Design a protein around this ligand. Structure first.
Ligand SMILES: *[C@@H]1O[C@H](CO)[C@@H](O[C@@H]2O[C@H](CO)[C@@H](O[C@@H]3O[C@H](CO)[C@@H](O)[C@H](O[C@H]4O[C@H](CO)[C@@H](O)[C@H](O)[C@@H]4O)[C@@H]3O)[C@H](O)[C@H]2NC(C)=O)[C@H](O)[C@H]1NC(C)=O
Length: 169
């Protein structure tokens, strides 16, 4: 059934990842993954608040009014890799990994997410912008990166910008 999840060793990692520069607000400009089946989606934002212990408080803001989804990313072995904090709260989830594949900190990021639940491996990549719009070249780059990971046209979606919720606080 599912497109096989790539190994974390085959997914790029941002070299010399800078947790201080990555912090703050990012807009989800596109999304691709093996559980993405394009039938678009309303843009949501994700705020990475860096803690003293170098974990992130990660708060996503979505349009339903507004929904907030709050979780913690705990640093893993390499800079730019994370696991999901408080795993006991997600009883479906056997493992969960986050990897910042590429970013220039002030414009865009591409982040890889993988999780195992129900003995099935899901993965997704997100195209983040510091604004709600990114260049055609960056959106093309994202598409080609998704396809390099075995994803198809049906698995790749770009979002519809909004001013509701996603700019809150
Ligand atoms: C990242 O995420 C965590 C949330 O999961 C967050 O840590 C939490 O912050 C809140 C707010 O500071 C803490 O709540 C306070 O805890 C202190 C000490 O135990 C309490 O005294 C506080 O009580 C206030 O309200 C009371 C109401 O009766 C008043 O009487 C009192 O005067 C206070 O005003 C309040 O409960 C909470 O304990 C932590 N939780 C954890 C697990 O650390 C952190 O701030 C976030 N960091 C960010 C966004 O940068």
């Amino acid at each position: 059934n599912l497109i096989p999840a790539p190994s974390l060793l085959t997914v790029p990692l941002q070299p010399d990842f800078r947790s201080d520069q990555f912090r703050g607000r990012w807009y989800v400009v596109g999304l691709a993954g093996n559980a993405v089946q394009k039938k678009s989606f309303t843009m949501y934002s994700t705020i990475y608040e860096l803690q003293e212990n170098n974990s992130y408080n990660v708060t996503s803001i979505l349009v339903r009014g507004c929904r907030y989804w709050i979780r913690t990313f705990v640093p893993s072995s390499r800079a730019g890799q994370f696991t999901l904090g408080n795993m006991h709260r997600y009883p479906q989830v056997q493992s969960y990994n986050v990897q910042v594949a590429t970013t220039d900190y002030n414009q865009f990021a591409m982040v890889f997410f993988r999780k195992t639940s129900e003995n099935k491996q899901y993965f997704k990549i997100t195209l983040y912008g510091r604004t709600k719009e990114l260049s055609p070249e960056l959106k093309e780059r994202f598409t080609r990166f998704a396809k390099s990971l075995g994803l198809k046209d049906d698995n790749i979606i770009f979002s519809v910008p909004t001013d509701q919720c996603i700019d809150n606080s």
